[PDB]
From a paper:
Over two thousand unique human miRNA sequences have been reported and more than half of all protein-coding human genes are predicted to contain a conserved miRNA recognition site. miRNAs function as guides for Argonaute proteins, which use the sequence information encoded in each miRNA to identify complementary sties in mRNAs targeted for repression. Argonautes then recruit additional silencing factors that mediate translational repression and degradation of the targeted mRNAs. Careful comparison of miRNA seed-matched sites in the 3′ untranslated regions (UTRs) of human, mouse, rat, dog, and chicken genomes also revealed that an adenosine (A) nucleotide opposite miRNA nucleotide-1 is a conserved feature of many vertebrate miRNA target sites. These t1A nucleotides confer enhanced repression of miRNA targets beyond pairing to the seed region alone. In this study we provide evidence that human [name] contains a t1-nucleotide binding pocket that specifically recognizes adenine nucleobases through water-mediated contacts.
We first visualized how [name] engages non-A t1 nucleotides by determining crystal structures of [name] bound to short target RNAs with cytosine (C), uracil (U), or guanine (G) in the t1 position. The overall conformation of [name] is nearly identical in the four different t1 structures, indicating that identity of the t1 nucleotide does not affect the structure of the protein. Inspection of target RNA omit maps, in which the target RNAs were excluded from refinement, revealed little or no well-defined electron density for all of the non-A nucleotides, indicating that the non-A t1 nucleotides were mostly disordered. Moreover, although residual electron density was observed for t1G and t1C nucleotides, binding experiments using the same target RNAs show that these interactions do not contribute substantially to target affinity.
Residue numbers in the entry: 22 to 120, 127 to 269, 276 to 296, 306 to 821, 836 to 859
The structure:
RNA sequence: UUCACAUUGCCCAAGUCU
RNA sequence: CAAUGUGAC
């Protein structure tokens, strides 16, 4: 349960496409570099302070140490040199004074860059991480002090333009940077990005932006409690400067004119000690430093210090502004990356140059293949076949594979009658039934119940009424006035309390209908009621389908930024037929920000039991698409989850030992692919076509991984989903697994489109997000309560309630 | 809460010294 | 999924 399998072979399927990748070839010398351990007393210091004290150390001790110029530093305890120092293994004790630190330098090892060549060149079977790490510290050294680091990125205020967001916020532009091995050479992966920062401005102006003042002196009265509290919400925890830098822990209730402390008042303290007649004595003070102490600063002598990222959620308007400032077509993104690289000129970086590293200033050429889509089999009399083109098809003149006959259905309208009238409801009903009939999901007559209601309180009694009164009720259609707490209450009651199918619809989509919205609505309804919308052309499926096989999708979704106690949510779904089309779901709450799926063995067990009850087959193979695990987590996640899958098999039966293929799906990474030739660009966004596959050149040097961009790019630059096989009892070839993966992206029931990840992984998200909806404002005994809230009713268990 | 795509929010990463 | 865009007939 540990070593990922070797790349079995290379894919051959599909016509070829010329692509460029945002990977830049690196020439690394075949030489040793030297590793040194450091430690800085005191070590509570931020990473950036350490880099300063080490920089001053290098220039200061230039002569009795560090004669061999230009070491690089990782911000804590690791230092590299291109040539060795006059150190020996002997520690060395040094003192440095920062404008008072002791630092010791112990040698630790060499890092043979020659061995890295070999690990890339099939000589060595494993890629030496420590060597990659060292190169990464080299490449990051200068920009970590020149710009503001944020994760694997770097940001800066852009020269000559501003992008204010308002509320004291503005857009900074930046780039991602990382060092990757590949089938070819080392790769410098660069991508542009953008994120919100606070403006380095006088706190006074910060006040005026936050409170929506055109200016100060507007007015000269002290702030309302309402104004003061809002300001306090914005600036608490931010850094300010007066030489001196402080973190704001509070805003005082009193103005500086009257705010006092044991020496005296604030206006007068600055008048006497600093000859400062405050221009705005009526305004409060910032509390800074130890919250137990009484260090107060008048607003007027304070600026927001530069380079503080905005952590808090952006407002709706800010968000709008942000989108508008950063939205880029694929060709425009490609050009921005290219521009940025020539601009960056990594080869003039003196530290890169110290280690004799060259970086190519143009994107790597790679060849892709565009896989053929599957054909999609519909039902009805005709049993129509739909042929995807550029990642899209449609249902016009096609009826579902297995369509549900709707005999008994109700409507609850929570939108106000004066806005969503009985006339709207009748027309909507008439249009829906038309579409549903063309779709082969005949809504056989009028609803058995149609009533207005208001408020979350009215939901449960209405639904209890409905469940008790109308035998054979298949659906409640729920009209909502827009965003409302009622939606989450409908799903609480429908999904977990009473076990009743619901389909919510926004009022605007009832008032004004279109065929496409209504048709998409039917796709969800048919599914919710147990129907099969369509299936993969059977004879066009890869060979793996000749034997019972179950397809699992798995995801964990973590709490938002800044959260502290909300659970993370694990979801696992499993196919329940051979098409494969129908899925069932499992879901758990688990520990805050834990990626590993804790209860996975019990989840898979459930899915396997339900698969047998639906199909009367025991799977011979299990295919496990595991979403969202980053590289730095492959081995941890696979050790626990692979064994749990086995555990589930083993505790069911017998030496029931079906082969497992464990695949990590990453939609979010920093690889971007672009059409080399302008005439391959698809649509306004100019993206690579659906089906573009890459498993050469930029992928892993020994393991089994590939990019597949399964979807049509509508806007921006498409994320090519990445697939990495951590385990494979089934010995897929590249072709069969890539084609399987692609084909699974055409089985997603909520649209007649090839989506960006396979359907099982997509459903797992939907399951996790629904649990999250079940926990709204409810997030050992804690654990039990939350577990209970995400638990669907018995009659919901076997359904695609998440669709 | 018709739907997909895309930006952010998510494990690793990053962050924390009068 | 939520905020915001681009689209689907
Ligand atoms: Mg996830
Ligand atoms: Mg961490
Ligand atoms: Mg949206």
């Amino acid at each position: 349960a540990f070593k990922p399998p070797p790349r079995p072979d290379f894919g051959t399927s599909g016509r070829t496409i010329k692509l460029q990748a945002n990977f830049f070839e690196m020439d690394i010398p075949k030489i040793d570099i030297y590793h040194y351990e450091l430690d800085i007393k005191p070590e509570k210091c931020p990473r950036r302070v350490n880099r300063e004290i080490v920089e001053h150390m290098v220039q200061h001790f230039k002569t009795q140490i560090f004669g061999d110029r230009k070491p690089v530093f990782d911000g804590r305890k690791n230092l590299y040199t291109a040539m060795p120092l006059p150190i020996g293994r002997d520690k060395v004790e040094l003192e440095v004074t920062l404008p008072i630190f002791k630092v010791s330098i112990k040698w630790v090892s060499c890092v043979s860059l020659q061995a890295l060549h070999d690990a890339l060149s099939g000589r060595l079977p494993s890629v030496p991480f420590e060597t990659i790490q060292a190169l990464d510290v080299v490449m990051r050294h200068l920009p970590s002090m020149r710009y503001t680091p944020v994760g694997r990125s770097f940001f800066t205020a852009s020269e000559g333009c501003s992008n204010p967001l308002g509320g004291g916020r503005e857009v900074w532009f930046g780039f991602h940077q990382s060092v990757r091995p590949s089938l070819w050479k080392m790769m410098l992966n660069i991508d542009v990005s953008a994120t919100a920062f606070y403006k380095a401005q006088p706190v006074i102006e910060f006040v005026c932006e936050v409170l929506d003042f055109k200016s100060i002196e507007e007015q000269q009265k002290p702030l309302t409690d309402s104004q003061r509290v809002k300001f306090t919400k914005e600036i608490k925890g931010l850094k300010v400067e007066i030489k001196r830098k402080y973190r704001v822990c509070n805003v005082t209730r009193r103005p500086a004119s009257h705010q006092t402390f044991p020496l005296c008042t604030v206006a007068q303290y600055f008048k006497d000690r600093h000859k400062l007649v405050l221009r705005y004595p009526h305004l409060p003070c910032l509390q800074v430093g130890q919250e137990q102490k009484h260090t107060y600063l008048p607003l007027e002598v304070c600026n927001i210090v530069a380079g503080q990222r905005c952590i808090k959620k952006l407002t709706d308007n800010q968000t709008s502004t942000m989108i508008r400032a950063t939205a880029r077509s694929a060709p425009d993104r490609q050009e921005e990356i290219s521009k940025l690289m020539r601009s960056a000129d990594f080869n003039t970086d003196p530290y890169v140059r110290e280690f004799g590293i060259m970086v190519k200033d143009e994107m790597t050429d790679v060849t892709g293949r565009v896989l053929q889509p599957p054909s999609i089999l519909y039902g009805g009399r005709n049993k129509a076949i739909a042929t995807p083109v550029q990642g899209v098809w449609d249902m016009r003149n096609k009826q579902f594979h297995t369509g549900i006959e709707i005999k008994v259905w109700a409507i609850a309208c929570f939108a106000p009658q004066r806005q969503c009238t009985e006339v709207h409801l009748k027309s909507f009903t008439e249009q829906l039934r038309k579409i549903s009939r063309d779709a082969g999901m005949p809504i056989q007559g009028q609803p058995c119940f149609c009533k207005y209601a208001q408020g979350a309180d009215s939901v449960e009694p209405m639904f209890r009424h409905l469940k008790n009164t109308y035998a054979g009720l298949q659906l409640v259609v729920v009209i909502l006035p827009g965003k409302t707490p009622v939606y989450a209450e409908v799903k609480r009651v429908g999904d977990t309390v009473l076990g009743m199918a619901t389909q919510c619809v926004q009022m605007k989509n009832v008032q004004r209908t279109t065929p496409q919205t209504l048709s998409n609505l039917c796709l969800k309804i048919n599914v919710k009621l147990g129907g099969v919308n369509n299936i993969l052309l059977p004879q066009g499926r890869p060979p793996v389908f000749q034997q019972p096989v179950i397809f699992l999708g798995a995801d964990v979704t973590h709490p938002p930024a800044g959260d502290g106690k909300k659970p993370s949510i694990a979801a696992v779904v499993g196919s329940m037929d051979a098409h494969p089309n129908r899925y069932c779901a499992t879901v758990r709450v688990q520990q805050h920000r834990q990626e590993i799926i804790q209860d996975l063995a019990a989840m898979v067990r459930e899915l396997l039991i339900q698969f047998y009850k639906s199909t009367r087959f025991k799977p011979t193979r299990i295919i496990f698409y595991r979403d969202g695990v980053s590289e730095g987590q492959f081995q941890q996640v696979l050790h626990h989850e692979l064994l749990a899958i086995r555990e589930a098999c083993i505790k069911l039966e017998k030496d029931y030992q079906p082969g497992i293929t464990f695949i990590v799906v990453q939609k979010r990474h920093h690889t971007r692919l672009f059409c080399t030739d302008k005439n391959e660009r698809v649509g306004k966004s100019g993206n690579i076509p659906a089906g573009t596959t890459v498993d050469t050149k930029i992928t892993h040097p020994t393991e089994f991984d590939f990019y597949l961009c399964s979807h049509a790019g509508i806007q921006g630059t498409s994320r090519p989903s990445h697939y990495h096989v951590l385990w494979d009892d089934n010995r897929f070839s590249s072709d069969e697994l890539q084609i399987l993966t692609y084909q699974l992206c055409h089985t997603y029931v909520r649209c007649t489109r090839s989506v960006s990840i396979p359907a099982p992984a997509y459903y797992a998200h939907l399951v996790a997000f629904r649990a999250r909806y079940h926990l709204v404002d409810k997030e050992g005994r804690d654990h039990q309560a939350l577990a209970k809230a995400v638990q669907v009713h018995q009659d919901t268990l076997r359904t695609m309630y998440f669709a």
